[PDB]
Design a binder for this molecule. Structure first.
Ligand SMILES: Cc1ccccc1Oc1cc(-n2c(=O)cc(C(F)(F)F)[nH]c2=O)c(F)cc1C#N
Ligand SMILES: Cc1ccccc1Oc1cc(-n2c(=O)cc(C(F)(F)F)[nH]c2=O)c(F)cc1C#N
Ligand SMILES: *Cc1c(COP(=O)(O)O)cnc(C)c1O
Ligand SMILES: *Cc1c(COP(=O)(O)O)cnc(C)c1O
Lengths: 364, 365
């Protein structure tokens, strides 16, 4: 159980550089930078020295376990060009923690978290002009970890590739807030107790595409993932779910589903709970929320705001849920949205260096 | 929509051929033949013409959805060199049915099932000397279907590759005789859930299983017994369907297997075994729920005869033991012959190797 070291980085700069895209006409994860990180592993020799080199196709054996048994995991984090023109990562330690834990659950080989971070930092530094010159755009960092075992045997891989892509992304909505409609159909399940839903393992995402297409066919933008006999609301697509409301006890509450195995422990989710705890202005509950809790609250005018949280869209307001053939209105946009707007501004201010924070590291 | 057609096959023969492996010293899925099938798809142009060409690395964009969101599915079926030296596929139509259905559930593009079969048949024909000269070995056919979308967007792919590998494989167990397995039963891990993809051969179902398989091996077990629900239903033996041969609660001789309620992969071998047992008409055949309590209650009453896994891998794999809640539970399969397991093995083996005629076999094109 060794590791690749950032000290050993072999840098092959590209001799031909690509034009950067317009920040205001960007489709998410469509455009890639000049360079990538790649690190080879084998059971026989362990970690090879890491490479920063030009973006290129991967040459994979067609038996590679990533292609057959989804022996794969990824991360998502961003680099932000601040108002002071300094580039910052946001809580990147939490991403490295989550990637390591996911690697263990996948049986992919462990690595030193600080060494991968330093390798990512060198990659973003070389491609730093790709971090858009825009206070509403970012560079998406996609660490990826794949089994490359050339064997059809269902086993712990004896060959893996860890690589990192960079992709400049614009504002989540090309437009201020575009509130989403959620397609809520309990027939589909994202994740289950005893499953891998609390990891960013590829297997969790492939099974979701069918339901996402069903959502789009019914003029919704995301899936509301329901779970269990009592229809728990768990996640908004690939975003954590927050409910701002008067609870059953008549108390002002920010509620989110708890980490009981079926929720991806989001970085944004952690940051929002940390903020709401620190503010000390209302109750903060990691607790179960059902469609009946929600509809009961809406008939009693107890619901203020619902929003998704994630690296993608820091705070994504929900306006409507389609469920049992009815459109259910969530009055998020008629209540400001006051708290969603405040949370967006606090995280945005930290990300873009408008305010100092422990949560940000300036680029190496 | 539309489909690639076998009539459009572009064949690029290999100019250098590899030596075949020893039929008696084969490891599953480690050795590959001279050629592969590849077919490109895009939303813009649809299916390109299929290629049979030398085995080669795939050139994939590192954003390919197969690498990120497991936008992928596979099949497993075998070609058998029979006692009459004729090469036979076994129920290959059922594999094409299952691949199509899996493609729909994955949001990968549909294709004509007959055209893929004919493409596979041409591939196996060109590489037919790879079908081992051994009546206890096979050629494993691995159809694979991957999203190759160069975009990190979590979406229906606008780019896919369908390809087929061939791998000569020996008997499941080296000895050729039954090597009975121990199952590691830990309810903490769940293979599949209602509203999930457990009834498809989608890659996502398999990645989550490796950790549990390693836990099994660490406790001297060979396979995972997949438990489900508050009452601990026995569902599957690793990547094999589960059969229980026993006296049921009604005092009747019964072959039981869990039913296709969404959390069971509809196995070809599973279908063949039910078809046989129905046809024989010698005992009750029940697609029904089986719990660890049903099993342990039956063992206390000496009501259990045989437990076996079923699958293309190991036609019939006897179970001798289950580790569950820190106790070793003995299944007396090997002390009861195993009579039914042995009969089922013989019938399917005889069909596969052309010892007996059947509708279930197609001779090679
Ligand atoms: C790429 C990714 C995978 C898994 C979890 C999170 C994640 O991050 C993002 C996801 C998305 N994204 C999609 O790719 C598709 C959808 C649709 F709704 F269409 F399914 N929604 C989305 O938010 C995005 F647009 C941006 C980011 C970012 N940053
Ligand atoms: C490769 C494959 C994938 C999914 C479903 C079935 C399937 O078929 C097989 C599986 C296995 N196989 C493994 O790959 C590992 C394991 C252990 F659990 F031990 F890791 N057991 C096994 O039976 C095998 F040995 C042969 C065949 C065949 N043909
Ligand atoms: C990535 C992800 C999230 C959000 O996590 P962040 O670290 O906040 O980006 C939420 N749910 C699922 C299922 C995810 O995959
Ligand atoms: C493939 C598979 C089976 C058995 O399939 P056969 O067609 O009989 O080889 C059983 N369970 C799982 C999970 C499988 O993937």
């Amino acid at each position: 159980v060794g590791t690749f070291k950032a000290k050993d980085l072999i840098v092959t700069p590209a001799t031909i550089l690509k034009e950067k895209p317009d920040p205001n006409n960007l489709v998410f994860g469509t455009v890639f930078t000049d360079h990538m990180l790649t690190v080879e592993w084998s059971s026989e020799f362990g970690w090879e020295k890491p490479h920063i080199k030009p973006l290129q196709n991967l040459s994979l054996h067609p038996g590679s376990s990533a292609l057959h048994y989804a022996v794969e995991l990824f991360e998502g984090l961003k680099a932000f060009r601040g108002v002071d023109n300094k580039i910052r990562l946001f809580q990147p330690n939490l991403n490295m923690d989550r990637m390591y834990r996911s690697a263990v659950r996948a049986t992919l080989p462990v690595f030193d978290k600080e060494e991968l971070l330093e390798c990512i930092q060198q990659l973003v530094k070389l491609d730093q002009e790709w971090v858009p010159y825009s206070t509403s755009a970012s560079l998406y960092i996609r660490p990826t970890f794949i089994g490359t075992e050339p064997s059809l045997g269902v086993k712990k891989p004896t060959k893996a590739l860890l690589f990192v892509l960079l992709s400049p992304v614009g504002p989540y909505f090309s437009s201020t807030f575009n509130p989403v409609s959620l397609w809520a159909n309990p027939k589909y399940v994202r994740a289950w107790k005893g499953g891998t839903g609390d990891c960013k393992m590829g297997g969790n995402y492939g099974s979701s595409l069918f339901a996402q297409c069903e959502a789009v066919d019914n003029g919704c933008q995301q899936v509301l993932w329901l779970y269990g006999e009592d229809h728990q609301i768990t996640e908004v697509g690939t975003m954590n779910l927050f409910l701002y409301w008067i609870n059953e006890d008549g108390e002002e509450e920010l509620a989110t589903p708890p980490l009981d195995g079926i929720i991806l422990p989001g970085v944004t989710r952690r940051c929002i709970l940390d903020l709401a705890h620190q503010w000390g202005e209302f109750k903060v509950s990691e607790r179960y929320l059902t469609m009946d809790d929600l509809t009961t609250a809406l008939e009693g005018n107890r619901v203020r705001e619902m929003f998704g949280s994630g690296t993608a869209c820091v705070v994504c307001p929900v306006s409507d849920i389609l469920y049992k053939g009815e459109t259910i209105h969530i009055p998020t946009m008629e209540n400001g949205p006051k708290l969603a707007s405040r949370i967006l501004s606090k995280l945005t201010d930290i990300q873009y260096g408008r305010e100092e924070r422990d949560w940000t590291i300036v680029l190496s």
